[PDB]
């Protein structure tokens, strides 16, 4: 069975979606620890704009705090509370 | 409230998730056309394995067919049935 064009368009247009984000990318400067899990489920802006001059970006953000295992390899481990960015509303905007 | 570690671990482990995939990356050879929408929602393997020698990969695949607008700039447009890969089951596997 075939997905109709207006359904595809609509499901794929710029909106907040559950995205699995590598933690090291949210904390690029971290040089002490590796993380377990190495990625977290965040509501984030995804999808497309139909428009090579527009990009899908957040208008309304919030924080969420998670417990993440932090391992300093060959030294030890603990669990730390970590803060991440989440996107509540997305709009398509000039670059 | 804080997301508990065992909830984060579980939600983030390697599984099929709805992912927005740019069409030009599924059809790297098709420079002739622009696509509208430029990306499609596909069930794909995401999340983490928590072992740098394991990676999240598909064990069971299927096709899905979607109608995509294809524009050949300054020539015309039509709607074409296009086929994509989808992931039904994901496992963590040696790399």
């Amino acid at each position, epitope marked *: 069975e075939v997905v109709k064009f207006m359904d595809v368009y609509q499901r794929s247009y710029c909106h907040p979606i559950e995205t699995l984000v590598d933690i090291f990318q949210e904390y690029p400067d971290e040089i002490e620890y590796i993380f377990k899990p190495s990625c977290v489920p965040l509501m984030r802006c995804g999808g497309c704009c139909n428009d090579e001059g527009l990009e899908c970006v957040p208008t309304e953000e919030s924080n969420i705090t998670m417990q993440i*295992m932090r391992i300093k390899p*060959h030294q030890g481990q603990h669990i*730390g509370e970590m803060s991440f960015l989440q996107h509540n509303k997305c709009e398509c905007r000039p670059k | 409230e804080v997301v508990k*570690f065992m909830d984060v671990y579980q939600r983030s482990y390697c599984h099929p998730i709805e992912t927005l995939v740019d069409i030009f990356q599924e059809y790297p050879d098709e420079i002739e056309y622009i696509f509208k929408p430029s990306c499609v929602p596909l069930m794909r393997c995401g999340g983490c394995c928590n072992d740098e020698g394991l990676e999240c990969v598909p064990t069971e695949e299927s096709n899905i067919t979607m109608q995509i607008m294809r524009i050949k700039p300054h020539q015309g447009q039509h709607i074409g049935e296009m086929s994509f890969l989808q992931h039904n089951k994901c496992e963590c596997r040696p790399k």
Partner: antibody
Amino acid sequence: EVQLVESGGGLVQPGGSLRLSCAASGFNIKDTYIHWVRQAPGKGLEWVARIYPTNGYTRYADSVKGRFTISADTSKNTAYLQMNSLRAEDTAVYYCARGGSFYYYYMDVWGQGTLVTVSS
Amino acid sequence: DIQMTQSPSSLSASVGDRVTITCRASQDIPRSISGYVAWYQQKPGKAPKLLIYWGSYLYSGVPSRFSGSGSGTDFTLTISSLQPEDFATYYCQQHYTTPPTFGQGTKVEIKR
């Protein structure tokens, strides 16, 4: 069933040497850390050493540094503690223990222990 | 080098009592941080046995009367309903850092 069995303890004179063994079954020591931990008579637990068998990475307590050496033979699935230059204070039951995995720093399986008596 | 201070050093409690044992890290660690302590039970002439790991997780096969909690510097092992077979010395361990270190122990005697 996962197990560790130490051997090699005994009486040894001050200044002497002794080597202990720890044989694993039901898992491969390749996949985790193996520790030695000791217990002087009537006292508490004192970590002495740890090995990551694959690459052979080792760490020691200060109280045995330069005197004890920890090693693992992955083909025999056996770990060892070579103890040199022994003093009366080294007297203790010596335990072998594994940490569940490279990502686990707790010790979930311990052997039965082997007594080392350092006396003239 | 983190020292763990365990308390009490000994106690006497009755069958069925809720027993609480405490461990404190010598280094200042914030309350956002948890899960770096394991608890062990040692019976006479026996090896230690893991009860609780990552601060609060019950190890496979351990009776559910055992639990643990804590954050920052302060950890607790709780025996919700003390049994005769719970006579032992209980040790905490930190693995925030290496060398891993053990508290000095707590001797639990059963009052009968």
